[PDB]
C-alpha cells in the first residue's frame with residue numbers, strides 16, 4: 001500500500017515500570033504489546049516510526065518507604081525523570097510519543113516530559129482516578145497517585161517525596177478529563193468534586209452514550225483552542241471480560257466498541273501528541289488467549305489512535321483494476 | 324444512613340427446578356451483610372424462615388402445582404415483612420422463587436396504602452391460574468395482587484387470605500423479553516406500563532428510569548417496592564437461574580436501575596429472587612450470580628460507581 | 642400468517658474452511674421448524690439441496706478458487722428460489738457460505754425487480770474477482786449483483802447466467818467492521834449507503850433501522866431481501882463462523898434489526914449464512930450459534946420480546 005488518508009510520525013518507548021505497584025508481571029506489558037504486532041500495525045497505517053526500544057530501570061538500592069506506606073518512591077521518581085527526558089526529546093523532534101507500560105505511575109514522567117507543549121490537555125481513560133495523594137493513599141502504590149503530582153491546584157496537599165523534587169505541576173484541574181471511572185476511593189471522590197475536575201464515569205456513559213461523552217470531552221478541553229492531546233489509557237478502563245490481563249480489574253467497563261470509539265475520536269481531532277498504554281500484565285491472565293486478547297486490544301487502541309477505523313478508509317485505494 | 328431488615332425466604336414450590344431454596348444462603352455467603360454494613364446501614368437480620376410444610380398438596384384441576392404450600396409460605400412471609408416495615412425498616416427479602424412476591428408485596432401493603440412496584444424481570448409473572456400453561460405459581464404472582472384482575476382470578480386452596488393491593492397504574496415492569504400471549508393481552512388491555520428489552524434498546528436505560536418514576540411518583544411521593552428477579556440480567560452475567568432468557572440487562576444497566584431507585588430516597592422494600600446456585604455448570608458461575616445479587620442490593624442502598632457513599636470531609640495536609 | 646419455504650443450501654466452495662455445509666442441518670437441529678410453526682407460519686421444507694459436483698474446476702487466473710462449482714450451485718439455487726417464490730412462499734435459505742447470496746438474490750429479482758437488500762454482516766462482501774486477495778468467492782457476491790459495477794467485473798466460468806439486478810441505491814449494509822481498502826473505495830465511489838459498527842455506536846440501532854428504511858422504502862413499498870451473515874454478531878455470541886471479527890452486534894441489536902424487518906410486512910426472502918459448527922471449540926459453542934441463527938429467522942417472521950405474535954382478545958373467567 002502506497003497511499004494513506006494521513007501520515008503520522010510516531011515514536012515508541014517501552015517503559016517496563018512495575019515499582020508503582022505490587023503485582024509482578026506488568027514489566028512484561030511492553031513485550032506483550034510488541035508481540036501482538038504493534039510496529040507492523042502502525043507501519044500498515046503509513047506511520048513514520050522511531051522505535052526508542054525498551055528503557056532499562058535499575059532500582060535504587062536503599063529506597064526506603066515514605067511515611068511507612070509509599071513504596072519505592074526514589075525508583076518511581078527517578079525512572080519517571082529519565083522517561084520524561086525521552087518523551088520531551090521525541091515530542092521536540094516532532095513525533096507523537098507512544099509509551100507502553102508498565103504501571104500507570106509512568107504517566108508522571110510522560111505527562112511531565114510532554115509539558116516541557118505547556119498548553120497540553122489530558123484525556124485519562126481508566127476505571128480509576130489515580131488521584132490519591134501520598135497522604136490519602138491506603139495501599140502506598142504510586143500507580144494510584146500520579147495525577148496528584150501533576151495538578152497545579154493540588155500542590156499544597158502533596159508532600160515532597162524522595163526522588164520527586166524535579167517535578168513541577170504542569171496541568172490545571174480544567175485541563176484533564178477522565179473517562180470510564182467506576183472504582184473511586186472516598187478521598188478521590190472528594191478531590192474530583194472539590195477541585196471541579198470533569199469526569200465521565202461509567203454511569204455518565206450509560207446516560208449520555210460514548211458519542212456525547214467524546215463531544216463533551218472535546219468541548220471542555222479543545223473547545224476554546226487547538227491544544228496538543230495527551231491520551232493516558234489504562235487497559236483496565238475496558239470490561240475485564242475484554243481486558244482480563246491487568247492488576248485491578250473492575251466489572252462493568254467499556255465495551256470493545258466504546259474503547260475504539262474513544263480512540264477514533266482522538267485520532268479525528270488531529271491533535272494527539274502523546275499516548276500511554278498502561279497496566280497490561282500478561283501474568284494475570286488465566287490463559288494465553290486471555291493474555292493475547294488483552295495485548296491485541298492494546299494494539300487496537302494504539303492503531304485506532306493513529307487512523308485504524310471500523311469502516312476502513314485509512315488505506316487510500318487509487319482506482320479499480322479493469323478486466 | 325438506612326434502616327435495613329433482611330429476611331431469607333428459602334422457598335421453591337412456586338416452580339419445578341430444585342435448588343432455588345439455596346439462593347438466600349448463596350447471597351449471604353457472597354457477603355451481603357458486610358457490604359450493607361460498609362454503606363452505613365443499621366441492620367436487622369430476621370434469619371432464614373422455616374416455612375410450615377403442607378404434606379398433602381398435589382396438582383389442582385390437573386394444572387396448578389403446590390397451591391396450598393405456596394399460599395401458606397406466602398401468608399407466613401407477609402407476617403414477617405409486615406413486622407419489619409411497621410418497625411421502620413426497608414425490607415430486603417432473599418429468594419427463593421418469584422411466587423414469594425405474593426407474600427412480600429401483601430406484607431408491605433399492610434402499612435403502605437399508596438405503595439408502587441418496580442418489577443425487574445425477563446418475565447411479567449402475570450398469568451392468572453386460568454391463563455397459565457405451566458401451572459407454576461412463580462409465573463402468576465402479580466395476578467393475585469392486581470385489583471383489576473380480581474374477577475379473572477379463581478380462589479385457589481390456601482389463597483383466601485390474599486387481598487388485591489395494587490392497581491394497574493401502580494406497577495411498572497423493566498426488562499421483559501419472554502411474555503406469554505395472555506400476559507401480553509393483560510399488559511395492553513389493562514394499560515400496565517412496561518419497558519421491555521426492546522424499549523430499553525430504543526430509549527436507553529436513563530429514559531426508561533425517568534419515565535418509570537414519572538408514571539409512579541410524578542404526582543406524589545410513594546414508598547417503592549423493588550421486586551428484582553436475577554434473570555432480568557443476561558444469562559452470561561447471571562447463569563444460576565431456572566428460566567434464563569438470552570438478551571438481558573447488562574451489569575451497567577442493572578446497576579443503573581438500582582442507583583436510580585436509591586436516588587429517589589423512597590425504596591421501602593426489595594425482593595432479590597430466583598438465584599438457583601445448583602443450576603450453574605461450575606462453582607465460579609454460582610458465585611458470579613450471588614456476587615451480582617449483592618451488587619444489586621448494595622446499589623439499591625447507596626453503593627455507586629463514583630465513590631460518593633463514604634463521605635470524606637478534609638484531606639490530610641503535609 | 643406467513644407462508645415460509647426453508648431451503649438447505651450446503652455451500653462450502655465459496656471459501657476454504659470446511660464445515661459450513663453442515664450449517665443448514667445445525668439450524669434445523671436447533672428446532673427451526675418447531676419455532677416457525679409456533680408462529681403460525683405455513684411451512685414447506687425442501688430439505689438440503691444436492692448440487693452437481695464439478696470434478697475438473699481449476700483456479701481462475703491463479704487466484705479464484707472453485708469458480709464453476711460456486712457458479713453452477715448458485716444457478717441451481719436461483720431456480721429452486723424462483724420456484725419457491727412463485728409458489729407463494731417467503732424464501733428462507735440456510736447456508737452455507739455467503740457466496741449463495743448470488744443464487745438467492747438472482748432468483749428473487751426474477752419475480753421482484755424492484756427488490757431492495759438489507760445486508761447484515763461484519764463484511765461488505767463486495768470485492769471484485771480482480772480486487773480479492775484470498776480468491777474466496779464468499780468475499781465477492783455483491784460485485785456480481787451490482788449494476789453500476791458491471792464494467793469492473795470479468796466474466797468467470799459458470800457466472801455468465803448472472804444478470805446484474807441490484808442498483809447501488811437499493812442495497813444498505815448494517816454491521817460493517819472489517820472492510821478491505823478496495824471495498825471502502827467501492828462503497829464511497831458508488832454511493833452505497835452503510836451503517837458500520839461506528840454508525841451504530843453513534844445513532845443506536847433504532848435510528849439505524851429508521852434511516853435504512855428511509856433510504857430503501859422512503860418513496861414506495863418494495864419487496865425486502867434480508868441477507869444475514871451470522872458473523873455480524875459479536876464472536877462471543879456467534880463463535881461457530883469462518884471470519885469472526887471482535888466488536889459486533891449484540892443479541893439485542895440483531896433481534897431489533899429482524900423485528901423492524903418483520904414490522905414492515907415487506908420481507909420476501911431471507912438468507913442465514915456462515916454458521917460452521919466445526920469451527921466451534923465445544924458442543925455448546927456450536928449449539929449457541931445455531932440457536933442464535935433460529936432467533937434471527939423467527940424474529941424476521943414475528944417472534945417478539947413482548948409476546949405479541951399470537952392474537953389474544955379475551956381472558957378466561959372463573
Ligand SMILES: O=C(O)[C@H]1NCC[C@H]1CCCB(O)O
Pocket residue numbers: 104126127128129130132137138139140141143144145183184185234236247248279
Ligand atoms: O490507590 C490505590 O491503590 C487504589 N485506588 C483505586 C484502585 C487502586 C489504584 C489502581 C491504579 B490503576 O488505575 O490501575
Ligand SMILES: O=C(O)[C@H]1NCC[C@H]1CCCB(O)O
Pocket residue numbers: 421444445446447448450455456457458459461462463501502503552554565566597
Ligand atoms: O407461566 C410460566 O410458567 C411462564 N411464563 C413466562 C415464563 C414462565 C414464568 C417464569 C417465572 B420467572 O419470572 O422466573
Ligand SMILES: O=C(O)[C@H]1NCC[C@H]1CCCB(O)O
Pocket residue numbers: 739762763764765766768773774775776777779780781819820821870872883884915
Ligand atoms: O475477500 C475476502 O476474502 C475478505 N474481505 C473481507 C473479509 C473476507 C470476506 C469474508 C466473507 B464473509 O462475509 O464471511
Ligand SMILES: [Mn+2]
Pocket residue numbers: 104126128130143234279
Ligand atoms: Mn491507571
Ligand SMILES: [Mn+2]
Pocket residue numbers: 126127128234236237248279
Ligand atoms: Mn486503572
Ligand SMILES: [Mn+2]
Pocket residue numbers: 421444446448461552597
Ligand atoms: Mn420472576
Ligand SMILES: [Mn+2]
Pocket residue numbers: 444445446552554555566597
Ligand atoms: Mn423471571
Ligand SMILES: [Mn+2]
Pocket residue numbers: 739762764766779870
Ligand atoms: Mn458475508
Ligand SMILES: [Mn+2]
Pocket residue numbers: 762763764870872873884
Ligand atoms: Mn461476514
